[PDB]
Ligand binder design. Structure first.
Ligand SMILES: [Cu+2]
Ligand SMILES: [Cu+2]
Ligand SMILES: [Zn+2]
Ligand SMILES: [Zn+2]
Lengths: 153, 153
């Protein structure tokens, strides 16, 4: 009935965060949390494929993409399962994460349990950029902090 | 077909390690890797319920126990699903992990994906200690290092 998850974001830099997930029945995944130590503005936020922290955030691999689609924003029909768009930090360096998404899940084929949340150096262009990179990573740049998505009480 | 997972163990002391998991279909889970910085002797080694790292190893909660049993050793009928017994550290503080288990899984109800691996200060008494604590934790004591079990390549 009710699934819950948690992710502790850590990096080599000063970006830290806690993300909570909750999914009631087949209702959407409600995502809520904070990230701190960010530069002011938009930062890409995606579920990456692998919950593998052997190489910091590098070993998380690419956006979770079981449908083998191109990169989008959450509202796009053409998106990675893992494409959760951008979070906005204010001048205090804090983003409030508040996302509702029905493509991700906490169970079944699309479950993100044991995958990695990543927050990025730069704005995700939502796949609307001109170059090839936009269709891949939305040009969100480097990985500031990541964590493995765990089952929570 | 084949499912792989990985766990990086960390704590506030000298203990760390990387644990690898593989499962072919509905078969046994094969557990390998190494842990360093341990005292010579046997150390409890379990899957705990929650992949929650908000309070170090404490927020991992109790042994994974979906069948509501008492603690035991991996060979016991009466055991928690997370009960993987003891790893053994040599004079040099290194444990070579080599376990095959039939209760844990990398998918379905027994999945340890998104849960926590914990290595303990003391030997697990395999539920044979004759106090109530033996029937919960095997008297394995404190949690030296832990990490969330992630989907791996
Ligand atoms: Cu990303
Ligand atoms: Cu334990
Ligand atoms: Zn993407
Ligand atoms: Zn137990």
């Amino acid at each position: 009935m009710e699934m819950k998850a948690v992710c502790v974001l850590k990096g080599q830099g000063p970006v830290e965060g806690t993300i909570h997930f909750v999914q009631k029945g087949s209702g959407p995944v409600v995502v809520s949390g904070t990230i701190t130590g960010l530069t002011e503005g938009e930062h890409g936020f995606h579920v990456h494929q692998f919950g593998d922290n052997t190489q910091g955030c590098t070993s998380a691999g690419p956006h979770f993409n079981p449908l083998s689609k191109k990169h989008g924003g959450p509202k796009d029909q053409e998106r990675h399962v893992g494409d959760l768009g951008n979070v906005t930090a204010g001048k205090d360096g804090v983003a409030i994460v508040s996302i509702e998404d029905s493509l991700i899940a906490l169970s079944g084929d699309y479950s993100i349990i044991g995958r990695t949340m990543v927050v990025h150096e730069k704005r995700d262009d939502l796949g609307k950029g001109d170059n090839e990179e936009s269709t891949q990573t939305g040009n969100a740049g480097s990985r500031l902090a990541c964590g493995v998505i765990g089952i929570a009480q």
